[PDB]
Structures are given as structure tokens and as C-alpha cells.
Design a protein around this ligand. Structure first.
Ligand code: K
Ligand code: MG
Ligand code: MG
Ligand code: MG
Ligand code: MG
Ligand code: MG
Ligand code: MG
Ligand code: MG
Ligand code: MG
Ligand code: MG
Ligand code: MG
Ligand code: MG
Ligand code: MG
Ligand code: MG
Ligand code: MG
Ligand code: MG
Ligand code: MG
Ligand code: MG
Ligand code: MG
Ligand code: MG
Ligand code: MG
Ligand code: MG
Ligand code: MG
Ligand code: MG
Ligand code: MG
Ligand code: MG
Ligand code: MG
Ligand code: MG
Ligand code: MG
Ligand code: MG
Ligand code: MG
Ligand code: MG
Ligand code: MG
Ligand code: MG
Ligand code: MG
Ligand code: MG
Ligand code: MG
Ligand code: MG
Ligand code: MG
Ligand code: MG
Ligand code: MG
Ligand code: MG
Ligand code: MG
Ligand code: MG
Ligand code: MG
Ligand code: MG
Ligand code: MG
Ligand code: MG
Ligand code: MG
Ligand code: MG
Ligand code: MG
Ligand code: MG
Ligand code: MG
Ligand code: MG
Ligand code: MG
Ligand code: MG
Ligand code: MG
Ligand code: MG
Ligand code: MG
Ligand code: MG
Ligand code: MG
Ligand code: MG
Ligand code: MG
Ligand code: MG
Ligand code: MG
Ligand code: MG
Ligand code: MG
Ligand code: MG
Ligand code: MG
Ligand code: MG
Ligand code: MG
Ligand code: MG
Ligand code: MG
Ligand code: MG
Ligand code: MG
Ligand code: MG
Ligand code: MG
Ligand code: MG
Ligand code: MG
Ligand code: MG
Ligand code: MG
Ligand code: MG
Ligand code: MG
Ligand code: MG
Ligand code: MG
Ligand code: MG
Lengths: 154, 386
RNA sequence: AUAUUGGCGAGAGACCGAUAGCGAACAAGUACAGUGAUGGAAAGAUGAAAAGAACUUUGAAAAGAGAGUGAAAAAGUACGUGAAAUUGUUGAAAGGGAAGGGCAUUUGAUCAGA
RNA sequence: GUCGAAUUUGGGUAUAGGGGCGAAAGACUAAUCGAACCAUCUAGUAGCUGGUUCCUGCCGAAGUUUCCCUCAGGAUAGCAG
RNA sequence: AGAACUGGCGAUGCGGGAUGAACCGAACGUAGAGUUAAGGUGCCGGAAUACACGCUCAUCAGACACCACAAAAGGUGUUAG
RNA sequence: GCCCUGAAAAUGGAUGGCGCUCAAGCGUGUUACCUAUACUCUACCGUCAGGGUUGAUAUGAUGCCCUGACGAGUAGGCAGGCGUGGAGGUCAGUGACGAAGCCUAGACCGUAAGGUCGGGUCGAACGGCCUCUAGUGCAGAUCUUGGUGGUAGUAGCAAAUAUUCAAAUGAGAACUUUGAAGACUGAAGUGGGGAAAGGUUCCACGUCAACAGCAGUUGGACGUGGGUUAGUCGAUCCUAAGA
RNA sequence: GUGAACAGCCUCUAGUUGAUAGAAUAAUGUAGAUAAGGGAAGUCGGCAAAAUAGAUCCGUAACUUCGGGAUAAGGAUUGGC
RNA sequence: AGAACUGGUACGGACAAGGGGAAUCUGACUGUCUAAUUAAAACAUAGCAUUGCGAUGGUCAGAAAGUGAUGUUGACGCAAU
RNA sequence: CUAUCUAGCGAAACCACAGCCAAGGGAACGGGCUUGGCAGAAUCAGCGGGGAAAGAAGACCCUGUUGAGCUUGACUCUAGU
RNA sequence: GCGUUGGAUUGUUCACCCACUAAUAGGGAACGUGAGCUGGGUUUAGACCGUCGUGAGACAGGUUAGUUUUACCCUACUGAU
RNA sequence: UUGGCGGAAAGGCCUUGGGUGCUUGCUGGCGAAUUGCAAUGUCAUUUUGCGUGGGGAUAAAUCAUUUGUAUACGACUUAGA
């Protein structure tokens, strides 16, 4: 429990989280922001299309010197990617949230991603060897991912 | 300190930036000065560069070492089917330049030109100009009112013409639409000519004539990102050079503490708009005219098409303009041929050229025969046929 | 009678309170490095009590959502509290080649005193 | 370059720091050599470089005299509290 | 580069000299009002496109000391002796 | 006198800029006007000085009050204060009905060091005053230790010819296994054994949190076990340089 | 097997198929190459590269310590049957 | 070793594999060194020459020794250049 | 084969704050200050003008009453003889 | 505005000569330009010679050999969204 | 409502006829107060949203696929009911 700041009704919402997931934090942040606020089924279809390279995840903050693609145009950006590992983790948490909403008795057809946040887990440390007998860090940037889907209402 | 040895700078600073042209059809940025006593006529034409061949002609140049002798010259063939007039644009002069006041279109537009207004033609409803065609409902009152405005104003008149790209061997299938200034004064009758030619074709022979010096406006062949050595013609650095030698060694002095615009840098090469002038028309050939590639000395009944077809283009089945030399742009590219902006009387112009022979051998190799009949005559009977 | 940074047994302190105090509050002269002489760390705290999360559900699983234990899970062994740098989300605001600041007031938000 | 003898090389063994060893470069002597490494003397000395942690109030300089193995320092008088 | 007297900067902000350690003015607790210094009053920019007598036309005019340069020699240019 | 010639330097640029020609230029004169932390007056703060006031209810005579003048400041000196760890006394101080700590573009007080309060979090001690004491205040020291960024999802993971198809397993297969194919080491091997060294890496089963700079169901990994059989092979014995 | 050959190249037994991959084919690179005519004019300097190359036969100068120089130089031939 | 025949005159057809000549300076040569910027003309070398010494000795070690290297040696030797 | 784009993986140097110019003055070569020119999000591949770019408390020079290697009838000694 | 060269010698700037040419003008830009190159010279350590010095060593005296590191950041520029 | 003129950015100017409201050109009748002695004492136009009625119309672009006149990636150029 104790997710990030939310403003939705806990009785109309369902939560899902994953901690210390060995997936890139920056890629997963971009993936989460790509579906923040989307309807659940639309977001899942979009993630499947991202995995199929039919649509892309726009990279807005962590995008320096990444590359350009025509698939960022629908988001009004030139820089977009297809972070498959992040997408897979996100859709796993999305299906977990959908299962929790079904167990809570929420209407799956009104579910939208009312909250999704990715922050940095503790780094997993490895070593890389460099010229002239030097050693540098080779750490991972794992993620804590949390999301809550809420029934759309008025 | 000084350069320590003088040399001219590499490249022309008047052709900057060396960027991609904004459009594949190079813009006509200047039309011939209007002579308002002449009949109304087009000042340019649209064609497609088909390819190059070579010709033989008797040089008429008194005082030259080759006077009254045979010379072999390279020529470029531009396939120029007649262009269809589909509109007229009126241009009023303003303290801020020329300004289009209104455009009057033809009632019926072919699918060739309608495709130009669509990015996705196959899945569109083809609604373009469907409400505009209703302006011609009973008497065309709105059309006549707009034409009357063009007559009452619009000191400069241009017609909208489009190519018949379906008559070319190109797969593009989407016509090229361009504005051509109407020279021949009485703006009233400029508009009258445009309206009377609405939906009608204009043949290249009504614009251009034999021996006339014309200008070719086209986007050059693109070559992508290029280094300084070929983009600008700078000296190759010695073999000993660390970090590469296809570079410019000094891209600037310490001060100004900036790379200057005049220093050669790596970047895009080609796909630039170029207006090259003074290309003499060697032939105004007609599409329906069999023996197109024949002359009064050759008499071999052959078309202008080389054996096996123009490489990467196809066969010439339409009217064509054969100009001396080469013109910017590659084969299949739209090129605008425009009348010269001045009167050339240098005895290079005003020369009347008479072709003696036109090469129709294959450009797909070391072509040996001008015609299949000549190939049969030389080779005899083969096993497969002939 | 005098000395005593060793050994053994005691009593104390206006001393230090885990980067301090012996290097070592803990399997510390340990792990580890060096051929060797030698060099030599880091590392304390759930909770009164494991009562350390039965059971259900999603997932291949890790885990999640519940349920539950507990005074508290804003104590879940990655455990007392839980700063800052740095980061995510939400909310607010501003943004023509920095940002930040001083005086003054407009506007928005917020608030004390009477 | 050299490649059948002043050849290359394993193992054993000997030579240890102002010492060894050197077909000699101050070369090599465990990534250390115009004096190895380790610990201690040792928190070595430094007129030289860097830093030197709260507020407010009042007063408020000197780069000048003489002497010094003195000239990037000090003593002395002067200025200041 | 080295001396003499004084005033300063260092140690000093403030108004002016666009800008500047030293120049000009003036030295400073926190505020209000008035008046000024040096400097300015076409606009930037607060303040007269004020008043008055003349001089200058520059195909490199000139426009406030320190200060950011100009000389000898010349000109029926023009003005006054 | 003004103007002009004399009068040539390097990025494009400087009466400060624009611009200005009976000037907005030059020389001169007269007024009006603008504004400094300067002058004048007043208020407040502090400092210094000179005084008045123990005649009581006057508990603050280092107190209260009156008067005048003054206020720049590095190095530096002095004074009055703020804050921290611990100590003696005291407030029979605060506190599990919540101490300390922390967060808080919420409030109050002080010129300030700082102090106080509200709210949230939290869980066991802590504070005011009079004094004592010091390992007592950090922005720097290429400061020490630890942690964390931008760079940046960037540089890059390109030597050693080269991989491909299907099936099985598996949640997941470019990388595991099998089969088929294509290749290489080409006997001075990428083969088969050993010496030094390592020490279980050998083998089997289970198994993938970490490691194998991609992956992984695989492994020299992880977990549990099994395995090294000598009169004849070595050591042991001999002596060598030497110890 | 070719070949003088433990050279280079291909193959047999044995072993491996292990190097992060996929898609494109810009500049500039790293490595490998070619180039008309000229032939060191480049450059400090032929650096780099090219040219020559095995074997058989012919022929081989100055100088010389008589041993060499020497594969001097310079030429011809090479397959298959 | 020779002959005939034969072919796009190719043929050490891949692989493999000297460029050569005329001279100057320098070191005779083979060899050796600055491991990690200097391979050389530097060092060494054979050859030549000088020096000391007949053991109660020459040269050189050791703090000292009833100690030691040359020396299991003896001038055709050892030691120092 | 890179570079490029993608999936996975994923550092380091450096970093007062940062990053458009011209002139001025200024510690006499400004990214900031003054006066002008100007100035429109977010970016990709290259590039080597600039950041008096980074790498190192300049190795050159000087100073220090700071050393060390080496030399010599420097001063003062000393093993040996 | 436009051009101002090809070479022999020298590391050379400079110089000189050959030659073509319309001409072979002078200069600046951190004596422009080394994260552009190169490293011939100078200017570390090796070595030789001459002179000097008793010597270690000295020599704008000559000679030979002697590692030229990093851009992925910002701007500027070139192109591209 | 009749008609004309105006294209430099016209988007406005002029004009015909009738209807209709006001008319302070002149003469009257009624009302105003207490906003308390002032407090802009709210009278304008800029966009947007929403609801109620009426009028009008019934598409494209991009991704994906494809082309190569293009290209590092974007982009460009093509084709596809
Ligand atoms: K030394
Ligand atoms: Mg970028
Ligand atoms: Mg890149
Ligand atoms: Mg490495
Ligand atoms: Mg190593
Ligand atoms: Mg020049
Ligand atoms: Mg060309
Ligand atoms: Mg090189
Ligand atoms: Mg051809
Ligand atoms: Mg400790
Ligand atoms: Mg703890
Ligand atoms: Mg609690
Ligand atoms: Mg933690
Ligand atoms: Mg905690
Ligand atoms: Mg924080
Ligand atoms: Mg910008
Ligand atoms: Mg030496
Ligand atoms: Mg000390
Ligand atoms: Mg004072
Ligand atoms: Mg003395
Ligand atoms: Mg000093
Ligand atoms: Mg000073
Ligand atoms: Mg002053
Ligand atoms: Mg000035
Ligand atoms: Mg004004
Ligand atoms: Mg004069
Ligand atoms: Mg003058
Ligand atoms: Mg003025
Ligand atoms: Mg005047
Ligand atoms: Mg005042
Ligand atoms: Mg007093
Ligand atoms: Mg003071
Ligand atoms: Mg203490
Ligand atoms: Mg509390
Ligand atoms: Mg805060
Ligand atoms: Mg407790
Ligand atoms: Mg302390
Ligand atoms: Mg600190
Ligand atoms: Mg400080
Ligand atoms: Mg630091
Ligand atoms: Mg640190
Ligand atoms: Mg990369
Ligand atoms: Mg690489
Ligand atoms: Mg490989
Ligand atoms: Mg593989
Ligand atoms: Mg297999
Ligand atoms: Mg091979
Ligand atoms: Mg093979
Ligand atoms: Mg095994
Ligand atoms: Mg891995
Ligand atoms: Mg893995
Ligand atoms: Mg095991
Ligand atoms: Mg035996
Ligand atoms: Mg054989
Ligand atoms: Mg050639
Ligand atoms: Mg040739
Ligand atoms: Mg030749
Ligand atoms: Mg030459
Ligand atoms: Mg040359
Ligand atoms: Mg030369
Ligand atoms: Mg060579
Ligand atoms: Mg020969
Ligand atoms: Mg010879
Ligand atoms: Mg030799
Ligand atoms: Mg030999
Ligand atoms: Mg070396
Ligand atoms: Mg070498
Ligand atoms: Mg010698
Ligand atoms: Mg500048
Ligand atoms: Mg200057
Ligand atoms: Mg700067
Ligand atoms: Mg400015
Ligand atoms: Mg670069
Ligand atoms: Mg630079
Ligand atoms: Mg220094
Ligand atoms: Mg130093
Ligand atoms: Mg001294
Ligand atoms: Mg000494
Ligand atoms: Mg220079
Ligand atoms: Mg440079
Ligand atoms: Mg360099
Ligand atoms: Mg240079
Ligand atoms: Mg050199
Ligand atoms: Mg040297
Ligand atoms: Mg001598
Ligand atoms: Mg010298």
C-alpha cells in the first residue's frame, strides 16, 4: 500500500505495483507517461502495437541523442522508441490491476489508468574494466512501478 | 599571418545554403520581361528529363577551325507531352511585392491533376473541386465575375497548367501543376486566352521553336550527406593525416572565435534547385511523327528512343525537346524549360542547327546498332529467331 | 616507602554515544590485498511479544490486490525515526540566446491581528 | 633483425639496498631505481601554498625608520585597539 | 623605472564621467519632505526641439577635462582683422 | 576662427546608441528645469557625552528620565549578545491524553545570530532561568567518509571468415538439447596428454535471486551429493650447483 | 595432397561452430584494393605503396683480406598432353 | 634430358616469393643494451699494448675470526686498465 | 567492419553558475559588466573556431638560508693501508 | 571586385636560382591555424666529435636516434526534423 | 431598400425611396430626494464555454504497407478500396 499521490476514489479504483524490477527506469518512465490517463483497453492495445512496432512510445524527458522516427508524429514528437522490456513490465502490471478490479467488482469497460508512476529502485552494481587497469561502475537502473485504474464517472 | 600562398576559394558562395530544395519541382523565380505587343503565349513548359544521347551536325561558325565540318555533340531529351490548362491566377502589384488576387479554375479537372491535391488518393472520397464545379451551373456568373476582377486588376497574369504524366512511362501517375506567366499584353486578352484554353492542352511546339536558347530549371540529382572533399572540392589532406584526410584542415582562425559561414563543411550534396541558361533547342520533335530520330541526311525511319529504351526512363511517345548539352536534374525528374530572359546575339545563339544523325544505339551498354533492322543486317540469322 | 599504556580482579568519570569512542560495540586483527615484511576495513536498532502475514484471487514466477496480526505495516526482517543531494506522479505558476537577486507596486493564491 | 651456438628456454641454486647485478642504458633489482619495498623515529621541519566555522555595536591601520646570511622573513620604531 | 609635498585607492559604498580602484561631486545608521553638488535637459532618459549673438557643409563633419591621439605644411572654401 | 587636404590595417561597430545641419555641432551669455547614501528640518535605532532622579505605594538606581552631538570601513582590537554537547542549582518545569527528531511559498517576536507557535509525521525522553565547562557553530581547505546527479539511455558492447532450418523442452529460445545443413581449427590444431599453478572448477541431480558487460530453460554459476583404489607410475633413496 | 619444406592453401581423425543481435549502406574513419596520361614534379626524407621474386639454362663488373662481392648486374624458359 | 602436338602466347597461372646499381660518413664482422618514447656510429668482441704479482704475493672481500673469492689456481696464470 | 536506426546492456572524462555576437572599458584578448546588434519550443547527424576545453599543485626560469645523484687538494672527517 | 604560380637547395621563417605567367604585391586574424595534420628543426633522457674544464660536466657549436593523448558536452558552423 | 465607386492592407465611401423613434428650433405639466458631505461608484470590448431556436455542409492527414527521381534517422518523392 501507500502509493504515490492520487486523487481518485479508492472504492472505484484498483491498484497494482512491482518493486525492484530490473528494467530501465528512464525507458519505463517514458512507457508509463505514454499511457498515463488512457483507458485500460486502449492502453493495452497501444502497448501491443508498440511491441509489434506499429506505434511507438514518445520519449520526452530521457531522449537525448536517441533517434527519430515517423511513429512519433501522432504524439507531436520526433523522438520515440520501442522499449519492449518496459512495455512488457507495464502490461503485466496493467493485467494485474485489471484482475484486481475484476476481484473488486469494478466495471472493466469504464477503467482508465488514473495513476501511473515509475521511480528509481536501488541500483544493482556490477563492474566494467577500462584501459590502463581502471574499474568503473556498470550499474543497472531498476524501477518501482505503481499504477491504479479507476472507473470513469461524472 | 597571411595565407602564404594565394588560391581561389572552393565553391560558390552564391549557391548557399547547400540544402535540399523545398520541392522536387524547382520554382521559376523570374519570367521573361513582358512584351505587350506580341500575341499571348506561354513563357515556360513542363517536361520530364528522359535521358541523354549524342548527335552529329555541321558546324556553322565562320572563323572557327571546325567551320562547315562535322561535330559530335551531347544532347538531353526532355519528354514534353502537351500541358493541360486548368486555371488562371491574377497578380496585383503592391508596395509589398506581387500578390495573387484570385485564381479561377476550369470546370472539369482530370484525375491526373486531382491527385496532386491528395496525399492518400486511393482512400479519399475525391471531393476536390466538387463544389467549385457548381460555379459553372447555368451561366458561370461567379466565374465571369472572378475573371472580370482579374481583368480589372492583376497587372500580371499566370495560367495554371498540369502535366499529362499518364502519357509518360513514369509510374508516378500524379501530375505536376505549375504557374506559367502569360506574355503578350492586354491583360484582358491574357485572361481571355486562359479561359478559352481552360481544360485544353498546349503543345510544346506552340511555346518553343528550333534553335531557340532556353533555360532549364530543375532540382539536381541528390547525393545525400557528403564530405567537404567532394561537396566543395577542397584539397585532400596527405596520406599521413591522423583522424582522416577527407577534411578541411583549418576550419577557422582563432579569431573570430566561431566557424564562419564561408568555411567548407560536410553536409548535403545535390537536390538543389538550379536554373541553367542558354541551352539551344536542337529538336522540337513530335510524338505522332514516326522517324522522330531521323534527319534529312539519315532518313532511317527510327524514333528518338534508343534501342532498348531510355535507361531508367522508358520510351518517348510524346513531343520532346532536344537541347544541346546537359541540364540539371536526373532522368524521370520534372524540369521547367523557360524562354530566355534576354536577347542573345552572340553568334552562338542565332545559329541555325541542322542535325545530320541522332544516336539511337542502346545506352544500356556499348551499343553497336542504331536499329533492330541494322542489327539483323549485321548479324544475320540467329538460332532463337531472326 | 618508589614504578607499572603488560597480566588477573574490582570501583569509578562534568569522557565518546556507531564517520564518535580502541582498528575492532557485530563470527575484528575478521573479510580482503601483497611473494614477503606487512597493510587492514565496512558492518549496531522490526515489534512488548513473530503475533514474521492463515486464507482468497491475478501471475510461470518474483510478486501484486485483498484478507489478517499488531497500539501502529506511516514497524513486512530491502524492518525504530527516516533529513538533504537526486527522482517519479499530481497540483499551481512562469519561460523570444541562462537562471537566481534588490526597491516598488499590479494580479492570483494564502493568512494573522481587531 | 636473427634463426645451430656469445642461441632460446624450464626447474634448482647463488649474489640484497649505498648493497647486488650490469657485452654499460644509470640499465635491471616483483608495473617501484641517479639508491627497491615494509614498519618505526614521525603528527620529521617548512620564512612557502591552501583553508581557518555565529550575529550585532564601537574604534580602526600599514606597506614607512633602523638592524639582521635580510630582499616572499623577523626584530625595532611608527600607525591601531 | 626612481624620488618630494599633498590628496586619494588599497580599506569605499553613493550621484556623474556609457563602460573603468584612483577623475569630478560627495563619503554611507533606518525613513519622510525640501534643496542641491558634479553632470545633464531631442529620444533612449528625469529635465527648455529654451532664449540670444555669431561661426561651420565636411564624397573620412563635429560633438566636453582625466580619456582613449594627431603634426609640420597648405586652401579666392568661408568669416573676422 | 570654423571647415577641407595632409590623414594608410587588418572580424562588423561605435560623439554610449539613435540620430542631429539658422543642430541635438562649435564659441559665448542668460534663465528655467532634473536628480546623490551630499546639505536643511522631523521621526525612529544605536553610540558617546553632559546631567536630573532612593522622599515613599518606586518590585527593573548597571533602573527611569532630560539634553546635545555623532553613525563609511579591509587587516585588526574590544564590547554586548545568539546557538551546541556535558555539569551544579532551581522552575515540586514539559511529556505515551505524545518528549526528542524531522517536514511544513502557515503565524508571531528580534536589526541579527536566532527564538516562539500552529499543522503533519513520530515514538521516550526533553526544556526555561542563575551559574560551571568545552573535542561548542563550516561554503570552500585539488578538505575526510558516505551518498547522489547532469553528462546519458550517451560513448559504446565492431580483432579471432558464419551461421541457417525444423523439432523437443520451457511461461518465455538468436544463444539449451537433438536432428539436418553450411563452415573453421587443418596434426608447429581450436586434437589427445602433462609440468608449474589452481583446488573440486571433475561427475550426477535439482535449479536461475545474483554472475556469464545481450539473453538464457544453459554454465567453470547457485544448492545438494558422488568421485581420486598402486610392491611395479612418482615422491620416498642418491648426489649436483649449493644449503 | 600441392609443394624443397613442420611455409602458405584444401582435406581426413578429433574438436569447435564460442565471441550481444536485427535493419539499412550517409559523411569521416579502420582494414583491404583498383585506377587513364605523367612518373617523386609530393615530402625533411620515396614515408607508405608499387615494382622484383620459385625453379632450369646463359651471363655476371669495380674492388678484394683471394675467402668473397654474387641471386652482382643483365637475359631466356616454365602449362597440358 | 630431349621431341612432337596443343591453346585467346597461356603456363613459379591461387598460394608462395630478392628490387637493383654508382658512391660518401661511420662501426671491422657474428653478438649486446635503455622491459614501457632512443637498436645506434653506443657496449661487447677477437687483435694490440700497458700495469701489478713468485704465495711471508698481486687484486678484492669480512664487524671479527684458527674467516674468505681468484684458487681443484702459479706468469702460455691471475688480477687492473 | 564501424559510424547510423532499433531490442537488450550501459560507463567515463568533465561540471563556480552557465553558454549568440560586435565594440568599449576592464588584471591591458568577456558567456556575464556598459552600449548597440538582436532574440521563438523541443531537437538529429556531423564538425573541430571557441569554451585562453580536458588530462598534471610547469619538468623551463627564478626564489627558498628545501634536497638529492655525481665530481674535485671545497670544509670537516673516515674504513683501509 | 578579381587573381597573385610550378620547381632545385635548406627543418627552415628568410634567402637564392630555374621557369611559366597578366602578376608572380605586402601584410593581419593569440607572430591565424598541433583534441586539423606532420614532427624535418628546436627543446628531456642514448651516442659521437671539436674546443673548454683536474673532474663531474659546459657549449645560439656540429651530428645521429628519440610515444604528438581525449570530444559523446555547450556554443559556433554545416546540413536535417 | 435603389444603385454606384473603392484591390495598396479593398472590408470602406457615396447614394435612392418609404417606414419608424428622437428632436433642446420654441412654449408647458409631471418625476427625481435617504448613494445620507466624496469614494471609477460599475455604462466599454477581447476571447471562450454552455443552453435555447434558425440556416448550411457531409472530409482528410498520419501510422502501417509500397516506390527510389530521396535518404544517417527523421524528412522527401511515389503507389495501393
Ligand atoms: K637522485
Ligand atoms: Mg543533442
Ligand atoms: Mg551517437
Ligand atoms: Mg573495458
Ligand atoms: Mg591489468
Ligand atoms: Mg596574400
Ligand atoms: Mg564537379
Ligand atoms: Mg600519424
Ligand atoms: Mg550506358
Ligand atoms: Mg568505529
Ligand atoms: Mg538503522
Ligand atoms: Mg508509530
Ligand atoms: Mg532503503
Ligand atoms: Mg524506517
Ligand atoms: Mg528532496
Ligand atoms: Mg532557442
Ligand atoms: Mg647519461
Ligand atoms: Mg600539523
Ligand atoms: Mg571611524
Ligand atoms: Mg651577519
Ligand atoms: Mg605570497
Ligand atoms: Mg592588500
Ligand atoms: Mg572614494
Ligand atoms: Mg567616457
Ligand atoms: Mg523626458
Ligand atoms: Mg594649421
Ligand atoms: Mg580633419
Ligand atoms: Mg544629449
Ligand atoms: Mg551653445
Ligand atoms: Mg535621507
Ligand atoms: Mg550617562
Ligand atoms: Mg561603523
Ligand atoms: Mg563533548
Ligand atoms: Mg512531538
Ligand atoms: Mg521547503
Ligand atoms: Mg520505544
Ligand atoms: Mg572542533
Ligand atoms: Mg559541507
Ligand atoms: Mg570560508
Ligand atoms: Mg571536493
Ligand atoms: Mg567523494
Ligand atoms: Mg550507442
Ligand atoms: Mg570498438
Ligand atoms: Mg568476429
Ligand atoms: Mg550466436
Ligand atoms: Mg546444434
Ligand atoms: Mg586459414
Ligand atoms: Mg580449412
Ligand atoms: Mg561440468
Ligand atoms: Mg547478461
Ligand atoms: Mg538475465
Ligand atoms: Mg557446484
Ligand atoms: Mg619407479
Ligand atoms: Mg613431392
Ligand atoms: Mg596511374
Ligand atoms: Mg597506366
Ligand atoms: Mg618511367
Ligand atoms: Mg622534390
Ligand atoms: Mg615542393
Ligand atoms: Mg629537401
Ligand atoms: Mg617503405
Ligand atoms: Mg640475377
Ligand atoms: Mg655491389
Ligand atoms: Mg656493428
Ligand atoms: Mg648467422
Ligand atoms: Mg625503450
Ligand atoms: Mg625502439
Ligand atoms: Mg666501441
Ligand atoms: Mg565579444
Ligand atoms: Mg582593449
Ligand atoms: Mg568564460
Ligand atoms: Mg544588453
Ligand atoms: Mg571531432
Ligand atoms: Mg574548440
Ligand atoms: Mg607550481
Ligand atoms: Mg611541481
Ligand atoms: Mg634569505
Ligand atoms: Mg646535500
Ligand atoms: Mg601562432
Ligand atoms: Mg587548435
Ligand atoms: Mg596535437
Ligand atoms: Mg604549429
Ligand atoms: Mg625530430
Ligand atoms: Mg638528447
Ligand atoms: Mg682535457
Ligand atoms: Mg643550450
Amino acid at each position: 500500500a501507500r502509493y504515490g499521490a492520487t486523487s481518485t476514489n479508492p472504492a472505484k479504483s484498483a491498484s497494482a505495483r512491482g518493486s525492484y524490477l530490473r528494467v530501465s527506469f528512464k525507458n519505463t518512465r517514458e512507457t508509463a507517461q505514454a499511457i498515463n490517463g488512457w483507458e485500460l483497453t486502449k492502453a493495452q492495445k497501444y502497448l501491443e502495437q508498440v511491441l509489434d512496432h506499429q506505434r511507438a512510445i514518445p520519449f520526452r524527458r530521457f531522449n537525448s541523442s536517441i533517434g527519430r522516427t515517423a511513429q512519433g508524429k501522432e504524439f507531436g514528437v520526433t523522438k520515440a522508441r520501442w522499449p519492449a522490456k518496459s512495455v512488457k513490465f507495464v502490461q503485466g502490471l496493467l493485467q494485474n490491476a485489471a484482475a484486481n478490479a475484476e476481484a473488486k467488482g469494478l466495471d472493466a469497460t469504464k477503467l482508465y489508468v488514473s495513476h501511473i508512476q515509475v521511480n528509481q529502485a536501488p541500483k544493482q552494481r556490477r563492474r566494467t574494466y577500462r584501459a590502463h587497469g581502471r574499474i568503473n561502475k556498470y550499474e543497472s537502473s531498476p524501477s518501482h512501478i505503481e499504477l491504479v485504474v479507476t472507473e470513469k464517472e461524472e | 599571418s597571411h595565407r602564404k600562398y594565394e588560391a581561389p576559394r572552393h565553391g560558390h558562395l552564391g549557391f548557399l545554403p547547400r540544402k535540399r530544395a523545398a520541392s522536387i519541382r524547382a520554382r521559376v523565380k523570374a519570367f521573361p520581361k513582358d512584351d505587350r505587343s506580341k500575341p499571348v503565349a506561354l513563357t515556360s513548359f513542363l517536361g520530364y528529363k528522359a535521358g541523354m544521347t549524342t548527335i552529329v551536325r555541321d558546324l556553322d561558325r565562320p572563323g572557327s577551325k571546325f567551320h562547315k565540318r562535322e561535330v559530335v555533340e551531347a544532347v538531353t531529351v526532355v519528354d514534353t507531352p502537351p500541358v493541360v490548362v486548368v486555371g488562371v491566377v491574377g497578380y496585383v502589384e503592391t508596395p509589398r511585392g506581387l500578390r495573387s488576387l484570385t485564381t479561377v479554375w476550369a470546370e472539369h479537372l482530370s484525375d491526373e491533376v486531382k491527385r496532386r491535391f491528395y496525399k492518400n488518393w486511393y482512400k479519399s472520397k475525391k471531393k476536390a473541386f466538387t463544389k467549385y464545379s457548381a460555379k459553372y451551373a447555368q451561366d458561370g456568373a461567379g466565374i465571369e465575375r472572378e475573371l472580370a476582377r482579374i481583368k480589372k486588376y492583376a497587372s500580371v497574369v499566370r495560367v495554371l497548367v498540369h502535366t499529362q504524366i499518364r502519357k509518360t512511362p513514369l509510374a508516378q501517375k500524379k501530375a505536376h501543376l505549375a504557374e506559367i506567366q502569360l506574355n503578350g499584353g492586354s491583360i484582358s486578352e491574357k485572361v481571355d486566352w486562359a479561359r478559352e484554353h481552360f481544360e485544353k492542352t498546349v503543345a510544346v511546339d506552340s511555346v518553343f521553336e528550333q534553335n531557340e536558347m532556353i533555360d532549364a530549371i530543375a532540382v539536381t540529382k541528390g547525393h545525400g550527406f557528403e564530405g567537404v572533399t567532394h561537396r566543395w572540392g577542397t584539397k585532400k589532406l596527405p596520406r599521413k593525416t591522423h583522424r582522416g584526410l577527407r577534411k578541411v584542415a583549418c576550419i577557422g582562425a582563432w579569431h573570430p572565435a566561431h566557424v564562419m559561414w564561408s568555411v567548407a563543411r560536410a553536409g548535403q550534396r545535390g537536390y538543389h534547385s538550379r536554373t541553367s541558361i542558354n541551352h539551344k533547342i536542337y529538336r522540337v520533335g513530335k510524338g505522332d511523327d514516326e522517324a522522330n530520330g531521323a534527319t534529312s541526311f539519315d532518313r532511317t525511319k527510327k524514333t528518338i528512343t534508343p534501342m532498348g529504351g531510355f535507361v531508367h526512363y522508358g520510351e518517348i511517345k510524346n513531343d520532346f525537346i532536344m537541347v544541346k548539352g546537359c541540364i540539371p536534374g536526373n532522368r524521370k525528374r520534372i524540369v521547367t524549360l523557360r524562354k530566355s530572359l534576354y536577347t542573345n546575339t552572340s553568334r552562338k545563339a542565332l545559329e541555325e542547327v541542322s542535325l545530320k544523325w541522332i544516336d539511337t544505339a542502346s545506352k544500356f551498354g556499348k551499343g553497336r546498332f542504331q536499329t533492330p533492322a541494322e542489327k539483323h543486317a549485321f548479324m544475320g540469322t540467329l538460332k532463337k529467331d531472326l
